[PDB]
Amino acid sequence: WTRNPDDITNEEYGEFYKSLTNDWEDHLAVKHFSVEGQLEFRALLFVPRRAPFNIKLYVRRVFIMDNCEELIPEYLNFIRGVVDSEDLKILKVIRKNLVKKCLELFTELAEDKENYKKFYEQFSKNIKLGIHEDSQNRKKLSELLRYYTSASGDEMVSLKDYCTRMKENQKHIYYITGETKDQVANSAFVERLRKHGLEVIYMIEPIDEYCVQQLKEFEGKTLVSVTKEGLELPEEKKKQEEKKTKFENLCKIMKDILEKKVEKVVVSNRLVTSPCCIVTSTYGWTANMERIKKHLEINPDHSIIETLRQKAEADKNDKSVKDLVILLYETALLSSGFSLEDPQTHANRIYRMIKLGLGI
Amino acid sequence: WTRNPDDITNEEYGEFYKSLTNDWEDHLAVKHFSVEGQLEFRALLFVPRRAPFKNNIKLYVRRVFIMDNCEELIPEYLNFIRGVVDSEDLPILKVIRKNLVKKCLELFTELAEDKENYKKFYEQFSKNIKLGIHEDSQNRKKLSELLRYYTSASGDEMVSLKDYCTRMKENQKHIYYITGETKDQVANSAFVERLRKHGLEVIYMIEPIDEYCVQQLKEFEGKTLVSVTKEGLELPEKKKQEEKKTKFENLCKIMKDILEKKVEKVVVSNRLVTSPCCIVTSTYGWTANMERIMAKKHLEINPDHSIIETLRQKAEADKNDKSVKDLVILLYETALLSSGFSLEDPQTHANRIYRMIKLGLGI
Amino acid sequence: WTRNPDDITNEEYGEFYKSLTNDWEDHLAVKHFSVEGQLEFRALLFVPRRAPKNNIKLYVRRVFIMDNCEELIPEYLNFIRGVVDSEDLILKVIRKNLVKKCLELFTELAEDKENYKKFYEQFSKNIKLGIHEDSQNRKKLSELLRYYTSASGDEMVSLKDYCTRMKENQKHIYYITGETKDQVANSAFVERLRKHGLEVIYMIEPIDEYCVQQLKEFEGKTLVSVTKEGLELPEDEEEKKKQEEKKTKFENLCKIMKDILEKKVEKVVVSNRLVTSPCCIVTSTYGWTANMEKKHLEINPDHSIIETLRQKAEADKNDKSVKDLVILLYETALLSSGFSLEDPQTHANRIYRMIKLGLG
Amino acid sequence: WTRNPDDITNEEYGEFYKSLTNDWEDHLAVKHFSVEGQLEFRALLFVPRRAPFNIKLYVRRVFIMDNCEELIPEYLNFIRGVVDSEDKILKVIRKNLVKKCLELFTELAEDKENYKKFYEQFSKNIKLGIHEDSQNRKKLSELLRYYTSASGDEMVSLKDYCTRMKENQKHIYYITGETKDQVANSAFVERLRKHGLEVIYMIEPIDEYCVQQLKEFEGKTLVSVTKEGLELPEDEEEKKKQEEKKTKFENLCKIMKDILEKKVEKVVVSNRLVTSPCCIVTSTYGWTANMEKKHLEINPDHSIIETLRQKAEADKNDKSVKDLVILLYETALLSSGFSLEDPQTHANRIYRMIKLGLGI
Amino acid sequence: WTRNPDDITNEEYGEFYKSLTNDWEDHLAVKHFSVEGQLEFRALLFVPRRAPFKNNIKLYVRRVFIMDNCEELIPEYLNFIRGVVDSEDLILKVIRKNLVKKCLELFTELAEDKENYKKFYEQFSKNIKLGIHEDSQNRKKLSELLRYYTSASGDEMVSLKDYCTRMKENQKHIYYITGETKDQVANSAFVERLRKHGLEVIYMIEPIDEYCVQQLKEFEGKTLVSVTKEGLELPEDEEEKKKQEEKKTKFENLCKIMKDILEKKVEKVVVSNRLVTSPCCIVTSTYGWTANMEKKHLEINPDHSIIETLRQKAEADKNDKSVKDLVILLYETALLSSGFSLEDPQTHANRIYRMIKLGLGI
């Protein structure tokens, strides 16, 4: 019966919401609507203030059911409220309208720039889960997403904003996943993008890994991970092509040294200060997902790499060159969020180096 | 507490009800009583305003809660009742059920005395009274009095079986009913023509449960209910009839032979006026209506009808005629549709129809 | 053990099968394979002789894990019984191999026409259910369909077979759906096509309705229901001009019948699929056919009833007999075409009147 | 967040308790504390007014679990409330909740009037806890309250039982049985009562169960008065009186043991009888009369037993002496709360005794 | 297969039985039948050798498996039956009716083998009795299967049919007593006079019996009557209701005196027609709770010395203290004897001690 009129007050909605759910605080938002034509039903739906750790079904004002899956998808299982149908699985249509209507509410929630943070803080996970599952609403959900970026400082921003700041000739949305904003932001992988004023999205939640599988483009701009092989930057490929064949020798030398530990050793287009890093194949598991393969990129303009090619052009079968190459690889792994096959040998390799720094 | 005093206000009862059942509206009716001697217990029972859909009466023993659901505390047909039972003894709850049932029936009867507002109760719970007629053998008579039906004499009102009996003719020994899908379906059905013509009142049972309910409702005030869609309909001048039976006796045998194993007998009707014939079913088999919710059929013929009068003249004078064969089967087939059965093979029925049109046209 | 060997007698497979399923007879078919590389597993799968969510047992390193793994085999292949034994703790890759191999097995069965009857009798339902659900396989599946037709008599044929026998002026595959082969082979709908030796596929399973939705064409030819409005058939010029003289000859009668029939029917058109029947009811291009778990009256220009009706109607368009007779044609045509009557009792009273007319 | 303030009116506490439990009346008691340091958490706990025929857990105001089988020990499962925490290691929360409940119960006890309300409903649990909770056994036993032979209609504590003990009284005497009237008037408590030695009347079933772990109270052992060898304060050489009587009836005892064959294990001169001629006590371990083995103590100062001594010695084989001994035995069984292995025989025996008392 | 031939050997049925149910031993009996007309189905039903502790008949349609646990197919009391039903078409209330018909047919055929019926009856008598309670329709056919020890029967269990054959000319009732054991019921106060006169009493000595005789009201039109309820009717109308009518009014005084002393503890005190050697007993009301089940009349023996001399003592002053103590004692021991419990044993004891003091000096 409250489900039945309109211009109910906020306090009235609150009370119904509270008695319905045993919540001690009132609803964060409400969406209250009816449908006409084929099916006729009214829905009253609440967004709770806190994320959980169902909706009641009526036919003509008589209670039918509590737990009814099929009514609303799992990624929207936080929604509480009532659905009162007029009739007697075609309620698949009810599901389609409820999902239309929540999404509308979320969009409405998103227009209040200042207070969306409340909803988003709590339910970003569910939006993300939905991107994965709800193929038909992947676009409209993608517009609800918000991320920290290398341009965004302390604010989380929309992919729409990201696109506004895109360069003339930027075809790709760049992102990185990891544990913390600071870990990814100081990561080797973003050094060069970040130097040239390219914006990288910092995806720092575990779902994020799961979600980017499915989020393949936004506004016709494809997302690419700055931790996978073959980074496309937006002329000066001649500058690049020269460095590639300059270090082709050293690449072939390091690859043979590392044998089965990497698939390739290439010349980087993504490093500034770090000498090298470990990127992964486009289709394999990432370093961030391996918790629960590998190319090694070298920085042509780094001085450790620069003197390594000298040392390795003149004599490849050296004991020091081998040991120096492995060490780079090993530390690069650690740095790219991988774990060592055997840390004790890595340790001993470091003590050898330490001794060479110290006399005898 | 609330289950414990008296001269509680309606508002108090309502708030209690609402909390007990998470209903948004208060109760339609309330019965709050107590029992001495044998067992000691108090009961507060509510009738909701709207029917639901494992009973729902909370059992307490000395103000402490024991059970939410307790089969045996009240029969299934009364399961819409919501309320509390508080016993003082309890470790023989047949004693509780009997008093619970006694008191509801009483409440219902008081409801029935308020003519205007009985409709509210009845609209919602007549299903349950009818179910009880089927189940509760001991209270079958009392439940029968709470029943209400549309009749051929009642127009737009539902009337009681008591009112029905008040208007029975002098020599009428039977209450007549028909079961069907809607009010208009049964009222214009073949089976009430003659009864209706002679001002005999027919109860129109138009809900599915009615079929289940009349299995057990055999009489009311010592008058037996008889369905008007069954064989051997007895009416309240029998020699007028007996002439007509022996006159059309011949035709019946020729028709039955043409119809072979589709009908058991072909008989002369006592129930038709404007219709040439109908399909009545044996006293013991499933009704026609009880198949719309998914034998044996008799075909009754109308002695007074023109079609039958001149199909007799056609069948004395030669019984092997092809068109007489065709005419008999087509009466039988349409008689089936009419009586709410289904055609075994529709395609052949249509070709049968088209053949008879080719004839009513000259071709 | 049994899932490891491979020169294993049919008796040994049958024995395993019965103990696995508590069936009393052996299997109809067996498929026993292994898979290398990506994932390492063995499957041994059985087709039961009688048609009975899924019941494939999952083993890891000869240790029993699960009995009901919903992800292992698609819903439409749930009659498959047997075991998957793996070498390591995704399932999409297993599923992929299970459906590949079943389908392979099914095609091997299809080779032996004698034995494929036994299979298809029991599981054709599932092959159709699959055309509906599993689209990556729809094409392989549709080659396994077999239907009775108007030229197959007592054996079921495939669509490939149906296409070879087509006239090459014929663009469409014809089908009718209904309850029983006898019901459909005799319907007004197939009269003219059957006289022309044009082949109609008889589709006498409830699922066929479900399935023809998805099976929109075969080998570039579109399937057309013979129950639906506007049926196109080989239109020789000698003929399709004959169809226009009749068309206009009964132009007035069609209008007069539409008028009498008011809201019960959408158009009264002159027919092109009737030989001996005076008329039939066709449904609209989309929107429920007669098969229920939109309306056109087509009249037959060469049927004496229709020929006479034209004369009586064009003599006096408001004859109460003409009206009555038209509604009787309509009603009986509803009955033919698989519909129920909105008021049986009125149809009866109409029939009594027609009887009275052909008698005095 | 009612579980947060602490200027809370009882009205507000009650309103919360009712919404939490759907009870009609408010709480009997409320304990509402917080914990600082190790783990941080707040608890709001209620003692309902009527025993049932549990605890909601929130973490940082988020509902996690309604039923958590570790939060509170099983005997305290009547406590209704919420625990809200900062994060099995619920061990530590448990500990605290049981500490604070006992703290509260102790406080309820100090308010003599109202504790009776509490102890009526929950004594059962308190005893159930005596059985299970060894760490809190002593503290729980201080809550216990019993009818005694010196308490009237009032129930009294064990601490109060002890203040009235003679200091030569070593033991705390108890009797378990069905009703107060029944135990108070039993033959077992006759002489203790006469001496003014206090007997605890335990009349609940659980009491049998509880005394199995409640062995002492303030270093004073609990003896059942229903068991063999009762020890009571033996004034100087009153025990030398009890040794004359002992040898006086040494012979009678031997005879009755013979007569009683295997029904009874010993016949002894009682030290617990004033007016009853005899009684059946059970052995130190082995089922008491509360069966949900046997000695027969005779009263050396009862006229029946004194006469029996004379008849029995004059002639140990008299059938009247036999019949009289069996009858004494049987009626003593009935008194002591056992059943007769053959009532119809005992009946017949009585009929002979009646024919004797009358002369036929 | 197995459920479609016939002249299948026993070893075959046995093998099928074992595999179907995981029993180590083969079936005690088997019933394999088929049905036409309404529905068509075949049924293969086994009686196990041992009683177990939902039913389990496997339901097949056209030889494919459908359902293990299928209630409604066979009534609860017949849930020991294991086996298979293969229906040709699928109002399975019909199937149930035939299943039950054919089980009873099998039981009757078992009962025809006097010596070996014991094997079945030992295990399943409970289930038969449960049926008598539940299956109103088959109550008669089921009653024909029951067997009981009777006062006539010594060490054998007899049918009610045989009971009826031995009835005296003028005996209108079948007499029963229910109790814990044969020796207890057989030597009870309540059967003395019936037994003296050659009237057969059925000894019902299992708890289900109490439950069973509620519904088992007659047999061969002869009504069953408990010997522990008020108003026992004997056939003795040998013009000797006058004999009985004498004693009735002869002890009318003593009866009313005893009733006043016994106050609310008995409904009435009457002169008995069922005692020989006992002085009195406690019968219960025709409608209340029996004794054997955890309103009382006190019947008194008009021919017993104790009761003969108490009538003297009662007329010679009713108000006497010892008369009061003696009446309560008879009542009390009568209670224990008739299988009730004493409300307060300590006072019964103290009463006994007083009387013992009389017997002795004191």
Residue numbers in the entry:
A (entry chain D): 297 to 349, 360 to 394, 407 to 552, 556 to 613, 631 to 698
B (entry chain F): 297 to 349, 358 to 395, 408 to 552, 557 to 614, 630 to 698
C (entry chain E): 297 to 348, 358 to 394, 408 to 611, 631 to 697
D (entry chain A): 297 to 349, 360 to 393, 407 to 611, 631 to 698
E (entry chain B): 297 to 349, 358 to 394, 408 to 611, 631 to 698
Copy text verbatim from the article accompanying this structure deposition.
Heat shock protein 90 (HSP90) is an ATPase-dependent chaperone and the molecular chaperone functions as a dimer. In this study, we determined the crystal structure of a human HSP90 that contains the M and C domains (MC-HSP90) in a hexameric assembly. The structure reveals a hexameric assembly with triangular bipyramid geometry, in which the building block is a dimer.
The N-terminal truncated HSP90 (MC-HSP90, residues 293–732) containing the middle segment and carboxy-terminal domain was crystallized in three different forms, C2221, P21 and R32. For the C2221 and P21 crystals, obtained under similar conditions, the protein solution was pre-incubated with cis-dichloro(ethylenediamine)platinum(II) (cis-DEP) and cisplatin, respectively, before crystallization setup. All crystal structures were determined by molecular replacement (MR) method, but only the C2221 and P21 crystals were refined to 3.0 Å and 3.05 Å resolutions, respectively, with three and six molecules of MC-HSP90 per asymmetric unit. The P21 crystal has three open-form MC-HSP90 dimers in an asymmetric unit, which assemble into a triangular bipyramid architecture being arranged in a right-handed fashion around a pseudo 3-fold axis. Based on the observed 3D structure of MC-HSP90 determined in the P21 crystal, the sedimentation coefficient values of MC-HSP90 at dimer and each oligomer states were calculated by using the computer program HYDROPRO, and compared with the experimental values from the sedimentation velocity experiments. The atomic models of monomer, dimer, tetramer and hexamer yielded sedimentation coefficients of 3.7S, 5.7S, 8.8S and 11.9S, respectively. These HYDROPRO predicted S values for MC-HSP90 dimer, tetramer and hexamer models were similar to the experimental results. The agreement between the calculated and experimental values confirms the existance of MC-HSP90 in these oligomeric states.
